[PDB]
Structures are given as structure tokens and as C-alpha cells.
Amino acid sequence: QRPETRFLSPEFIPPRGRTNPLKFQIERKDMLERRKILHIPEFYVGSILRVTTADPYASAKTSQFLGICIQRSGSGLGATFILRNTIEGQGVEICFELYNPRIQEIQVVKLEKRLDNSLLYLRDALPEYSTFDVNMKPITQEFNQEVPVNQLKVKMKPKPWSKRWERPKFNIKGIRFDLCLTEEQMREAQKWSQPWLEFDMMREYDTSKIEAAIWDEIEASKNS
RNA sequence: UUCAGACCGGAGCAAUCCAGGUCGGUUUCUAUCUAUUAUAAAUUUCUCCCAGUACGAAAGGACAAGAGAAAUGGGACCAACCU
Ligand SMILES: [Mg+2]
Ligand SMILES: [Mg+2]
Ligand SMILES: [Mg+2]
Ligand SMILES: [Mg+2]
Ligand SMILES: [Mg+2]
Ligand SMILES: [Mg+2]
Ligand SMILES: [Mg+2]
Ligand SMILES: [Mg+2]
């Protein structure tokens, strides 16, 4: 059995603006020129990575970092992702540019999908979830063609949290809300819900034409 | 401060009073007329040097020239970040 679904790195998806499509073919040709030197592996928010940077100021030019991918955003050449880790008890985040020429090797130790598409809420979660072993070895993939969905509820510090996570606009399934909240506050949070949004139709973003076109563009670019 | 209430010194037999303190106390306008409603052509630090040299018995110790960084003020703009 060969389950086959093509994972397109999220920054090959052009934004909704009215920008002239000529711009996007340029960015694509550049970042696809970049793909051929530095190899960029798949990963998702929740997946654990280790990046090697060229560091001008250190003695060993290589700087090593390891953490969770908390969120990604961008498009074209300006793609970025954010790593999070606790070193010695200090919470540390880094923002990396995917296509930046300073980055030498990216390495995936654990490929994983956690329930929410961004976790900034690991800021208010207890220190365990942000801690990782600097030296852990890459734990490989069995080619199940199923990226494992780890459903893990989290514990949080007492309020306030850097954002209000209980409220509907965030759609957080990952947080454990029974232990961290009271019924009153769970009714409060329901006053900000906007039920009609999922049914808004016109607010929906259509892709697939573009998907076919640019995927064909990537095939065509690998061939040559 | 500056009215109406109120205490506390004091002054008056009192009513009341002292540019003496203290607490409290309504801030109204829908613009008729005149006036007016975006051109540009930078300013300042602090470093780095020079040169620890010129200057003085030593102790302390420069400008000028030349490379950098900022900050503020003009004019803009969202690839990223952040809202
Ligand atoms: Mg905050
Ligand atoms: Mg009296
Ligand atoms: Mg009052
Ligand atoms: Mg008063
Ligand atoms: Mg007034
Ligand atoms: Mg008029
Ligand atoms: Mg008016
Ligand atoms: Mg400015």
C-alpha cells in the first residue's frame, strides 16, 4: 500500500492580496534555487528541530539550537519559524529565517503534530513542556505516511496568561481547561464567540488552481 | 481662588466677621463674516583613530584632518516581526 499525499511547504502558498503573480514566480525560483543547496526537511508546529547557524562572534563558527517549532509564517523568501526551549530555567525563543544563507544544516529529531496550529500558549504552560534534552538523538520516521497526531493536554501557571487563551478566537484544543478555569469564566469566554464565522462562505480562501500550478512548477524545477 | 453647607482658633452681648486654616460644591454654544487647511534642497551627539603624541619639572593631558555608529527632526513604506 502506498498512501500518497504531497506536503507543500506552507510558504509556497501565496497570500490573499492583489499582488501581481509575477512576484510569486520570482520568489519561488529563488527559494527553489536555495532548496538545491541546503536541504529543508518537513516539520510541523509541535515538531522538534535542531538548527546549525554560522556564528561570526563565537570561536566554533557553528551555533547549535534545539526546540519545538511554535509557529510559522511568511511567504516566498521571507519564510520564518520559531523555536522554543528552556535552558537552565530560562525560557528562550528564537526566530529563524528558513531561507537565510547563515543557516547551514536543519535537522529533524522528532516529527510531530500537536493539536493546535500555533502554540504560543506554551509560554504560560508549566516548565516541563518547554524543556528538552540538548543531546537527544534523532528519532526516525517509519514511513507510515501518517504524521503522528499527539494529543496532549497541558497544565498552566495561575492567571494571568500572556494572552487570553480561553476565548473562542484562539480555538485552543490543546490546553486543559477543567483544572485551569471555573464555570463562570467558561461562560464569560462564550460571550465573545462569533458563531456565524464558519458559515461565512466568501471569507473562505480558494487555492487548488494555484496548488496545481506551483506544484507543477516544482516538478518542472526538479527536472531541469 | 471666588457664592450658597460645615467645623477649629480668634473677634464681638449678639447677628455675623479675619489677602487665617480645613472638608464639600453645575464650565452652556448647531460657525454668519474675516483668517486658515502639505513642495523639497538636514541638525546634533558619542565612539574609533591621530597621538598618551604637540604642551608642561612632572601630575595631568588638545583642536584640525579622516573613517564609523547612533539619536532627533523632515519625507515615505509592510518582506519579516509585532497589533
Ligand atoms: Mg502581555
Ligand atoms: Mg468658633
Ligand atoms: Mg464628594
Ligand atoms: Mg476646597
Ligand atoms: Mg467648555
Ligand atoms: Mg464654512
Ligand atoms: Mg464645533
Ligand atoms: Mg525617521
Q: Compute the distance between CA of residue A69 and CA of residue A80 in angstroms, rounded to an integer.
A: 10
Q: Are A21 and A71 in contact (CB under 8 A)?
A: no
Residues 6 or more apart in contact with residue A189 via CB below 8 angstroms: A164, A166, A167, A168
Q: At what angle do helices A208-223 and A22-35 cross, to 10 degrees?
A: 40
Q: Long-range CB contacts (< 8 A, 24+ apart) of A55-63?
A: A62/A104
In degrees and rounded to multiples of 5, residue A103 shows phi and psi of -70, 130
Q: Is A9 helix (H, G, I), strand (E, B) or coil?
A: coil
Amino acid A178 CA to nucleotide B79 C1' distance, rounded Å: 41
In degrees and rounded to multiples of 5, residue A29 shows phi and psi of -65, -35
Q: Report the footprint of strand B: residues with C-beta closer than 7 angstroms.
A: A 15, 17, 73-78, 80, 82, 95, 97
Residues 6 or more apart in contact with residue A137 via CB below 8 angstroms: A109
Q: DSSP character for A136?
A: P
Q: Compute the distance between CA of residue A221 and CA of residue A216 in angstroms, rounded to an integer.
A: 8
Method: cryo-EM
Q: Are A85 and A68 in contact (CB under 8 A)?
A: yes
Protein-proximal nucleotides of chain B (any atom < 7 Å from a CB) = 79-82
Resolution of the deposited coordinates, in angstroms?
3.4
Q: Are A66 and A49 in contact (CB under 8 A)?
A: yes
Q: Compute the distance between CA of residue A188 and CA of residue A176 in angstroms, rounded to an integer.
A: 17
Q: DSSP character for A157?
A: P
- Is residue A210 exposed (0-12), middle (13-18) or buried (19+ Cβ within 10 Å)? middle
Give the count of beta carbons closer than 10 Å to the beta carbon of residue A28: 19
Rg, C-alpha atoms of chain A: 20
Q: Long-range CB contacts (< 8 A, 24+ apart) of A30-39?
A: A30/A76, A30/A77, A30/A99, A31/A76, A31/A77, A31/A79, A31/A99, A32/A218, A32/A221, A34/A77, A34/A99, A38/A103, A38/A104, A38/A105, A38/A106, A39/A106
Residue matched to cell numbers 543547496 = A37
Amino acid A1 CA to nucleotide B82 C1' distance, rounded Å: 46
